[PDB]
């Protein structure tokens, strides 16, 4: 994978 910073 995801490009989202809130995923990890």
């Amino acid at each position, epitope marked *: *994978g*995801t*490009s*989202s*910073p*809130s*995923a990890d």
Partner: antibody
Amino acid sequence: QVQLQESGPGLVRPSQTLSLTCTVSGFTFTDFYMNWVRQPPGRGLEWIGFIRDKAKGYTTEYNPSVKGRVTMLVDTSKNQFSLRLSSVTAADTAVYYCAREGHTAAPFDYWGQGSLVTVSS
Amino acid sequence: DIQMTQSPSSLSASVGDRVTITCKASQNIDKYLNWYQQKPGKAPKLLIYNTNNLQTGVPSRFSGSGSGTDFTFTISSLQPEDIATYYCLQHISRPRTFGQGTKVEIKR
């Protein structure tokens, strides 16, 4: 053909546990996170949480809004993710969706059809 | 939590018109703001991710801009199949939060 499909809509009794399954095909589902989002009839959207991928051991993040009532599972042998929400109330009546995290285009690049769950005795 | 406020809440426009919807975050979200389109009874669909990136296959008439706390979604020339409710979504931090949505209706 990426496919997501929540288990069928139906009733849950108040103070009992909502259970859903999100059955997937058409992609390496073990390489993408999976989110759950719900939409109370006539209202907007709410992100419930996500379950991570195989590399992360399928660890989770939940919205504090359902803090402590939700667990999200995976059964890799069945191409399935599951959602359990305990002690439901009138607030938990909604259409529940599973939505793939995605890679470049994220989050929520593919969505199931959604399943309406109604809280009622 | 970051609260997302959209405007207007609904609007009606004629086919061919330019439609601009705004989305404001209560605090900075850098560029991490996505736009989804939902039709009654159907799931939301991703149109744009991270402010201005069109998802593959989405018509070129859709676009977005902004940064920080203030964002915009634009349909250059409204088409009949574009009626829906459009939602913004911040994902710079958890919990991920949605705007309340903007219902786009057509006058004919």
